[PDB]
């Protein structure tokens, strides 16, 4: 009855809006007015205004929808979205965000803004700069709504990810500033988005992000410790991988700044139970190829005696074996000779692992076998003079 | 449950940019240790660089198609504004030059069909001589 007519009613708006000739196509008519110089600017503004109403109306129906009518609206919505450029769309939709009083409609508007840019290039650099200023300005206003907050954080992540460098610096530095504050947000959704931005922001800024270094690494280490305790969070795995993947991002961009806090970095990799071994083992390969090995060798001894030796965790021990072994074939002869006393000191601790190990014989035997082959590698690549005292 | 999907997707996307090869988000202990050690070497041999190339190319194709779609669509749109301007005498300097180029473009093309002058010099000699006899007209 009423619904059947509405099913038929939205078939119209699809049919007319569907882009099946110059004169039939609505989308083409718009562009000619925009391309045409003598077209009145007031007329252009009406096109922008009429569209904000048109886009809002379709979103209102979709928000307040019935499966067959739901899909037709997306056909209508899809036809709507392609009517006008990215240029005029952003102008006509950005000032609708603040005006819109429904959290749903605002939620929907942010999503569409991104997909306009998912297939754009360098031509949108001036426009995106306008968008970033607006989205940043909306952040304090929409802190109350997690979903709106989460998505808008995600949007900058795509846009900082894509041609973020071309963006004007103050936005980047500003965007990094907002993210660091939002890392402390109690909502796990706000956090994971916050970490992701800083990765992309630090990825672009690089050394220039050092000013924020006190505000990223020390909190992140603290967040991981809280992450272990609150095992009941449904998003624990996503939260953990973000923290590890945060270090992984900066392990390629600021190795040596992170050299001092590398010990905490390794601590995260070891005891990140939720994250897969491949991810944890992968980021390890980044550390060796990016951070100087001598400092790692110094660190491996301290972590082993402190936590791993008493950890009684198979994954932590295995990955420590992977890290320690990985260093030795890659460490230089000069570094090996210089760092020999620490390695042998660690080696004695490794040999004594059987005394305190709570694992069965088979594991300890296998662990020793790994301990021996690496030791053979380390004693090789050295000279008599350094070794004779050590022997 | 939207948050779950959104949370996964942001994590899912970021994994690819930094760690392409690693899979995405969706017994005796001695066995576990060895498997991890075996995992270390195989992932080290993974051709991650090839993986990055494929993702770049797939995205590059998609953007290229849309840029062509924008280019073709605008070129069509650029024509009508000329048509309406030409019909209404709203030609600017630019339109009066592009059409002038078209006047040149077509005119040069028809010259190739129109054939060269030197053959005309001889062809006309053959032409007139055919005509005079068949028409006759001396009487």
């Amino acid at each position: 009855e009423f619904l059947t007519f509405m099913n038929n009613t939205f078939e119209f708006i699809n049919k007319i809006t569907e882009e099946t000739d110059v004169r039939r196509n609505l989308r083409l008519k718009v562009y000619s007015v925009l391309l045409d110089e003598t077209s009145d600017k007031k007329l252009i503004r009406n096109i922008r205004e009429e569209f904000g109403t048109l886009l809002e109306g379709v979103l209102f129906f979709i928000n307040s929808v019935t499966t067959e009518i739901k899909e037709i609206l997306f056909k209508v919505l899809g036809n709507v979205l392609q009517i006008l450029p990215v240029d005029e769309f952003v102008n006509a939709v950005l000032p609708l965000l603040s005006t819109s009083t429904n959290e749903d409609i605002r939620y929907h508007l942010t999503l569409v803004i991104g997909s306009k840019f998912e297939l754009e290039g360098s031509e949108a650099i001036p426009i995106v700069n306008n968008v970033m200023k607006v989205l940043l300005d909306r952040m304090p206003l929409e802190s109350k709504s997690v979903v709106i907050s989460q998505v808008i954080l995600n949007t900058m992540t795509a846009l900082v990810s894509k041609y973020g460098k071309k963006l004007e610096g103050s936005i980047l530095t500003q965007a990094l500033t907002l993210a660091t504050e939002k890392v402390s947000s109690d909502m796990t959704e706000v956090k994971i988005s916050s970490l992701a931005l800083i990765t992309n922001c630090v990825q672009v800024l690089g050394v220039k992000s050092i000013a924020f270094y006190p505000k990223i690494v020390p909190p992140s280490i603290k967040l991981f410790d809280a992450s272990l305790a609150d095992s009941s969070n449904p998003l624990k795995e996503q939260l953990q991988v973000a923290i590890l993947l945060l270090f992984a991002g900066l392990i390629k961009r600021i190795p040596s700044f992170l050299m001092s806090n590398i010990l905490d970095v390794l601590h995260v990799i070891y005891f990140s139970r939720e994250v897969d071994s491949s991810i944890r083992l992968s980021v390890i390969s980044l550390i060796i190829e990016n951070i100087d090995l001598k400092e790692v060798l110094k660190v491996l001894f301290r972590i082993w005696s402190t936590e791993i030796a008493t950890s009684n965790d198979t994954v932590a021990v295995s990955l420590f074996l992977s890290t320690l072994e990985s260093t030795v074939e890659n460490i230089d002869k000069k570094s090996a000779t210089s760092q020999s006393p620490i390695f042998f000191k660690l080696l004695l601790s490794l040999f004594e692992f059987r005394s305190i190990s709570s694992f069965d014989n088979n594991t300890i035997s296998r662990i020793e076998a790994s301990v021996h082959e690496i030791s053979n590698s380390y004693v090789l690549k050295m000279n008599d003079k350094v070794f004779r005292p050590l022997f | 449950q939207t948050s779950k999907y959104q949370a996964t997707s942001v994590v899912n996307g970021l994994l690819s940019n930094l760690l392409p090869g690693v899979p995405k988000i969706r017994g005796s202990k001695a066995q576990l240790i060895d498997r991890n050690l075996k995992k270390r070497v195989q992932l080290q041999n993974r051709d991650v660089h090839k993986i990055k190339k494929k993702c770049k190319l797939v995205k590059k194709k998609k953007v290229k198609k849309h840029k062509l779609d924008k280019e073709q669509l605008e070129q069509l749109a650029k024509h009508q504004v000329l048509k309406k301007h030409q019909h209404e005498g709203t030609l600017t300097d630019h339109e009066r030059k592009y059409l002038n180029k078209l006047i040149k473009r077509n005119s040069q093309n028809l010259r190739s069909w129109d054939l060269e002058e030197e053959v005309r010099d001889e062809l006309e000699d053959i032409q007139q001589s055919i005509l005079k006899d068949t028409v006759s007209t001396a009487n």
Partner: peptide, 24 residues
């Protein structure tokens, strides 16, 4: 003829997000 017969036989992301939002 049946022996011939057997031989013959032998030879949008936002829309997802929008829909996902309607679910909750």
């Amino acid at each position: 003829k049946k022996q011939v017969e057997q031989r013959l036989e032998f030879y949008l992301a936002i829309q997802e997000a929008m829909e996902l939002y309607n679910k909750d």
